[PDB]
Subunit: 116 residues, 4 copies
Amino acid sequence: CPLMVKVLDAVRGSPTINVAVHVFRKAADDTWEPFASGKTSESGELHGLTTEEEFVEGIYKVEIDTKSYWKALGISPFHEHAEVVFTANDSGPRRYTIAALLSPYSYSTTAVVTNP
Amino acid sequence: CPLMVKVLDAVRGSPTINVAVHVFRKAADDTWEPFASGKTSESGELHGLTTEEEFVEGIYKVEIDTKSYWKALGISPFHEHAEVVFTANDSGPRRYTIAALLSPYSYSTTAVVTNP
Amino acid sequence: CPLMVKVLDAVRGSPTINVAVHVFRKAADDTWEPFASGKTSESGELHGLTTEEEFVEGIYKVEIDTKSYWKALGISPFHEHAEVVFTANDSGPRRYTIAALLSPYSYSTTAVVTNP
Amino acid sequence: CPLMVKVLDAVRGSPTINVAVHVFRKAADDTWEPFASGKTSESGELHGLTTEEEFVEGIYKVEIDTKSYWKALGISPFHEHAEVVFTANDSGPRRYTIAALLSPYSYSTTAVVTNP
Ligand SMILES: Cc1ccc(C(=O)c2cc(O)c(O)c([N+](=O)[O-])c2)cc1
Ligand SMILES: Cc1ccc(C(=O)c2cc(O)c(O)c([N+](=O)[O-])c2)cc1
């Protein structure tokens, strides 16, 4: 699985379940081409977005629909979404975990990049 | 000042100087109109981006050029930038501080919103 | 496994391997009684610290030896360690994951608390 | 002011007012000597804890009473407090800002260290 997304809720201390995630890859004309999408599981994780063969070098964007999550919980959010833009595989294929820790007025994102 | 951006370096424990910041506002046709730009000062802060009169209701995007900051220190970071998108002034005028805490493979962002 | 500790490195974008972790429980005389200890695995995780029978209600402290980690990497750290103090199981047994994201001059900690 | 503490609420996007802060210094016998204390102001900041003359080399502990803050808002948070332990002024006098960003199940802390 070369790309995994994990989303956590800092208000409730829980994984964020059923949050929509969209992945894009930058096109030659600096536009965002859809690439993959899904919703997080009960563990807050989204697997199976891509394969090692499709996940070539390039710039990728991960958009997490955080606003819809907080609205479903009845909490007023600040951000429209959480976005993460990064260059992938520039030094050979890696396994990427994009982790996002969500609060209504703050979020953090980290990348855990390992070599299989 | 209705909009301030502050940027900190979590590796060195210091404000980030001369980091480029670009602000955009979503137009009626759902395109990003350039709104303001600047670079952070010695204190890591960028003031004077806009005025209360110009800073009307809308969706705004703040893009911080974190990659150039790390590259100038010799580091190839994970993220291409740090981008924050939010609705502003939907309940009347507020003062917004957008703060970003930077590491090579992680960043966090918060919003401090006050009512003068 | 009622208690797991996970530690991540925000500079290198990797799990923190071989970091020492010590767990204490507060004694009747407000002193810290040792409870469990270990070192993180290749995945940055420390499992098997306790059992559901031993992990009773109480106040617990998790101390992560972050200073030794950064010294081993040749990076100057700010903190002497990372500590997390929390009340456990006050509403029935839970599964706790204590996650720490480390930078030389900053750290974050979250708790993911689930019901089996 | 050589030592400042700033505390922010990541749920509401606001500084935290009237949060208790206690500072300790490690003595020769390895005990924590009370050094200074105060409460955060309307801006979430606590100034005037010490002077450059009194703030000598040593190991210091800053304990922020985050639990009382959340309890006053009706929330039972995960952490009992936020505690930061660090060596100060080992390379000469510095100015330290300890900043804490609070959520019910997560907190982050950073240090901004400057040389006047
Ligand atoms: C920015 C941030 C801070 C803390 C967390 C975080 O709490 C977390 C929790 C996990 O169970 C876990 O498996 C991972 N991970 O794999 O990276 C991260 C996640 C994101
Ligand atoms: C995501 C994050 C976490 C912590 C900080 C942070 O450390 C910080 C430091 C300041 O001196 C300061 O004035 C503010 N602020 O007002 O927002 C934040 C900044 C950003």
